[PDB]
Amino acid sequence: ARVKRGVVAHRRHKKILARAKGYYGARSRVYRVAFQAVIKAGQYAYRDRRQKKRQFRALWIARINAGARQNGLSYSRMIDGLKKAQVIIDRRVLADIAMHDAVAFAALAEKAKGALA
Amino acid sequence: MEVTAKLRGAAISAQKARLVADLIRGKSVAHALNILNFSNKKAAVLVKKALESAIANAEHNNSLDVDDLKVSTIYVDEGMSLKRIMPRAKGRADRITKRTCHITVKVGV
Amino acid sequence: AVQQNRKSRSRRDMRRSHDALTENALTVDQATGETHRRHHVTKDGFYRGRQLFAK
Amino acid sequence: MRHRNSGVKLGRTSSHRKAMFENLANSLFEHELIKTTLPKAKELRRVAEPLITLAKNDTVANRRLAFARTRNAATVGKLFTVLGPRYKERNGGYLRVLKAGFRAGDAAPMAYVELVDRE
RNA sequence: GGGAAGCCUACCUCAAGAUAAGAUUUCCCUAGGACUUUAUGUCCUCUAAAGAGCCGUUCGAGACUAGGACGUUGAUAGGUU
RNA sequence: UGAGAAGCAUGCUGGAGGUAUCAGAAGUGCGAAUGCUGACGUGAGUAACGACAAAACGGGUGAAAAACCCGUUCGCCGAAAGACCAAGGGUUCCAGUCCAACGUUAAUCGGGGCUGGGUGAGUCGACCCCUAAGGCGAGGCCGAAAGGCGUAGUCGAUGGGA
RNA sequence: GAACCCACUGUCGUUGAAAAGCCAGGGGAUGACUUGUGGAUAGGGGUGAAAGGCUAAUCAAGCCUGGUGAUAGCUGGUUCU
RNA sequence: GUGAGGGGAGUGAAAUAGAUCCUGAAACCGCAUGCAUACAAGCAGUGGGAGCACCUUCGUGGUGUGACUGCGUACCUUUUG
RNA sequence: AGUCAAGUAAUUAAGUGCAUGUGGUGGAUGCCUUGGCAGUCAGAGGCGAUGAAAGACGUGAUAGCCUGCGAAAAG
Ligand SMILES: [Mg+2]
Ligand SMILES: [Mg+2]
Ligand SMILES: [Mg+2]
Ligand SMILES: [Mg+2]
Ligand SMILES: [Mg+2]
Ligand SMILES: [Mg+2]
Ligand SMILES: [Mg+2]
Ligand SMILES: [Mg+2]
Ligand SMILES: [Mg+2]
Ligand SMILES: [Mg+2]
Ligand SMILES: [Mg+2]
Ligand SMILES: [Mg+2]
Ligand SMILES: [Mg+2]
Ligand SMILES: [Mg+2]
Ligand SMILES: [Mg+2]
Ligand SMILES: [Mg+2]
């Protein structure tokens, strides 16, 4: 019962090489480099799936700070006022409004400032 | 559309023939022939033979006029290489490869 | 001395990018009306109104 | 550095170069039309024209000098009897060098050397 | 305020790829159509300017290049005197 | 489509085998061992193109001539780079025809491919007669066997004989 | 001091023309000389004007075939979820 | 070039079944189209992301390229590392 | 309409990178056998001085090689 390793090995190598399309140099032609490239890409994806949330939260905080300083406040003071005013709107909707709806963000800042006083 | 002509077994490497083949890509048949006649390269005579064969085929089989023809596409492919042994110093031996190439020329219009 | 790593095909082509050929100066003769190299004698033996190898 | 230097080497020694130039001059005087390389053709003038200039006067000393420089009795005879009187009133320029393409053997530029009033 | 062969200028050379790409003087290019996605839009017809290059005779320039002079309105190279 | 090793359907080539489910046996999964075999890259169109002497021109054939053929000049060896035997190799010797491969380039040329020819002995040499060093060895001596030595003899030129 | 034999110095060569060479110099050159042909000595043996030198480009024990798939407390490698 | 090689015609179910002759993969080497690229530094990827070019079951769609940007010093063995 | 100044778009590819289409060298895979490997059941277990095992040279298509044969020589 002799078994030949042609078909299944060729199929595995073909799948590995197809999973690495678009890379530069031997990373798209040679199997030995393509395997390491695919593994490194998987690890980088696993790490960036965590880093993305921090990046977007920082972006939202920066935009909210810009809006609050435009409306004569700071990020810390506005967040403290909104927490004291019983407002539970998250930072995503706040940044969206600050970027798009100026009068709504002005009203929110006025409510936060009134709650601070 | 394209009248083709192939020359196999040119007894020259592809790297030396591509330099000549790059000169006549896109030119007219008359300008290409004039360029190939007054050159001193070795692959020039082979490219000229292939071009004349293509033009003759276009004239005879497809019945196309010669003044409207131009070098539409042209390329060189690798071929079978012969392997020989060269004796070096101190009893060592090296492998020499005599290279060969094929020329493909398609004239259009 | 010998290289420590392979040279990718990109660097090879970048180096070969100066290996292009050039055309010669060909003009039409005023007397015979044939294409010939400038400042050179025509293959039949004619140059500048004169004719060598009289037949 | 070869500032203001005149002469050629052609990958030859002094004696070989001198003998080759003498043989070229003799062949040109015999056949009146030769085909050689371009630098050899351009350098042949400086050795061919002085001989024709010397042959314009028919004396024993001039004949002996032409024989010492050519070492060919037939060449000296043909010179002093034909080419001397032919270029009697011409002020130099007895040769004509015309480029004739390249050699098929080694892609060397060729040239035709001709007399101005042959045949 | 004075204060050294020390630093910056001063002397010679290079230098606007200084992407911050500078300045000055002079010279050259001023037509007729079709279509669309009306835009320094795309295909046609008609001319190729001032200049640069190819080529040739050459150098006190030069590895190859580059640079300087000349090409019948010519003394650029050879020959002759 | 599933968490995965993987499964399913189908577009193009291919032209004759493949195999459900459940059981059984494995030469049953490769990226490395300065692993083995074959092919192909970098170096790279880079080095190199092989003592003492040197080449130039006119004509011929030929698709193509610096290398071939003919002729005219130059140069080198000449106690050899000239002319022959022994050993060694067997057709490389001559004629006709060809340039796919070989010739450190091309080749119309060749010690390259194909076809056909060529070696004539009483006096040359070999064969033959004789023998040196040495080999073998009837009987014989010795030795577990194989075998070792050796007499009469028989072979053995680098020598002697028309 | 030639042929011939040998190899003291220097240059070049070191993937060389050459797995020990070329060139310029050097020593012996009627003898303890050089050389052709045919034989003898075979591996714990032979030979050696003696260097552990030579014994088919291999010598502090030649080569080939078998015990043999010797042994290695050592180094390397060991494949799907 | 009375060469090699190729284009027509024809045979053949099939000639990228043409004698280097079933199917014919990868490394390696050309041609064409689409996008990006000549003031900006590093295991060459990953998470975002404007524009451009062809498709359409015309979209808070598909297929390619992807300027700009945060993070990021290969794999296996042997080692405390 | 025009000059001047400031600011700011588009336009280049000697070459290269990525994706797709079309080719070349290359001989893995798929299918097949003309060859091997291991056994069972029955035989036989030898050839030769009447010249053995193994070889050299010859014999027809036409020149060679492989088989057959031996001057009576593919009989
Ligand atoms: Mg001068
Ligand atoms: Mg296995
Ligand atoms: Mg493998
Ligand atoms: Mg591993
Ligand atoms: Mg060099
Ligand atoms: Mg000749
Ligand atoms: Mg023969
Ligand atoms: Mg012959
Ligand atoms: Mg022969
Ligand atoms: Mg005995
Ligand atoms: Mg006897
Ligand atoms: Mg002496
Ligand atoms: Mg900058
Ligand atoms: Mg830029
Ligand atoms: Mg990404
Ligand atoms: Mg027969």
UniProtKB/Swiss-Prot annotation, chain C:
Coiled coil: none annotated. Disulfide bonds: none annotated. The keyword Ion transport does not apply. GO terms for molecular function: structural constituent of ribosome. The keyword Ribosomal protein applies. InterPro entries: Ribosomal_bL32, Ribosomal_bL32_bact, Ribosomal_zn-bd. GO terms for biological process: translation. Residues 6-15 have a biased composition (Basic residues). Residues 1-43 are annotated as: Disordered. GO terms for cellular component: large ribosomal subunit. It comes from the Bacteria. Keywords: Ribonucleoprotein, Ribosomal protein. Residues 24-33 have a biased composition (Polar residues). Belongs to the bacterial ribosomal protein bL32 family. This is Large ribosomal subunit protein bL32.
UniProtKB/Swiss-Prot annotation, chain D:
PROSITE patterns: RIBOSOMAL_L17 (PS01167). One of its GO terms (biological process) is translation. SUPFAM superfamilies: Prokaryotic ribosomal protein L17. GO terms for molecular function: structural constituent of ribosome. The keyword Ribonucleoprotein applies. One of its GO terms (cellular component) is cytosolic large ribosomal subunit. The keyword Ribosomal protein applies. It holds the Pfam family Ribosomal_L17. Disulfide bonds: none annotated. Keywords: Ribonucleoprotein, Ribosomal protein. Signal peptide: none annotated. Part of the 50S ribosomal subunit. Contacts protein L32. PANTHER family: LARGE RIBOSOMAL SUBUNIT PROTEIN BL17M, RIBOSOMAL PROTEIN L17. Belongs to the bacterial ribosomal protein bL17 family. This is Large ribosomal subunit protein bL17.
